[PDB]
A paper describes a structure:
The hypothetical protein [name] is the gene product of locus [name] in the genomic sequence of the Methanococcus jannaschii genome. Its function is unknown, but on the basis of sequence similarity the [name] protein has been assigned to the dinitrogenase iron–molybdenum cofactor family (PF02579). The fold topology of [name] resembles a ribonuclease H-like motif, with a three-layer α/β/α architecture.
The crystal structure was determined to 1.7 Å resolution at 100 K using a crystal obtained at 277 K from 100 mM Tris–HCl solution pH 7.0 containing 50%(w/v) PEG 200. The NMR structure of the protein [name] in solution at 313 K has been determined and is compared with the X-ray crystal structure, which was also solved in the Joint Center for Structural Genomics (JCSG) at 100 K and at 1.7 Å resolution. The key message is that the two structures of [name] determined with current JCSG methodology either in solution at 313 K for NMR data collection or in a single crystal at 100 K show very close coincidence both globally and in residue-by-residue com­parisons. Relatively high displacements are observed for residues 10–15, 30–34, 44–48 and 66–75 in the crystal structure and for residues 35–39, 42–46, 52–56 and 73–75 in the NMR structure. Along the polypeptide chain, high B-value-derived displacements are noted for four segments (residues 10–15, 30–34, 44–48 and 66–74). In particular, for residues 10–15, the electron density is unambiguous and does not show any evidence of the Asp11–Val12 peptide flip indicated by the NMR data. For residues 36–39, where the NMR data are interpreted as a ‘sliding β-bulge’, the maps are once again unambiguous, without any indication of multiple conformations of the backbone. While there is clear-cut NMR evidence for the presence of two local conformations formed by these six residues, we found no evidence for multiple conformations; the conformer with cis-Pro104 did not refine well and was pushed out of the density in each case. Moreover, the carboxy-terminus hydrogen bonds to Lys36 in the symmetry-related molecule and to two waters, which together appear to stabilize the trans conformation.
Author numbering: 1 to 104
Write the structure that this text describes.
């Protein structure tokens, strides 16, 4: 069973085009294969520091920069979103059905 914290790169209406361009990071705690809680971290100068402090297990995004990939892939597994829908993607994540990004 998965017990993990996952960061998702979000626009107000959908998963964003990139980790870099998002409005906010949605921090989801998944426990006994269920979403238990959520939190918004705005993608501003402070939010960029905050996301590191969260110590997430995984990121879900559509695209990510070489720099951010280099930084986060040391510790964090980075998964590629499939379409725009965050709930569909959280489900796919839990099911083990998202692909792990190897190069941005």
């Amino acid at each position: 069973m998965i017990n993990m914290k996952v960061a998702i790169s979000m626009d107000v209406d959908k998963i964003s085009n990139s980790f870099e361009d998002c409005k906010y990071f949605l921090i989801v705690r998944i426990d006994d294969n269920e979403v238990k809680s959520t939190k918004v971290i705005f993608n501003d100068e402070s939010g960029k520091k905050s996301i590191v402090k969260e110590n997430v297990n995984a990121i879900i995004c559509k695209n990510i920069s070489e720099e951010n990939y280099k930084k986060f892939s040391k510790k964090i597994e980075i998964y590629h979103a499939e379409g725009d829908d965050v709930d569909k993607n959280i489900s796919l994540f839990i099911e083990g059905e998202l692909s792990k990004i190897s190069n941005p």
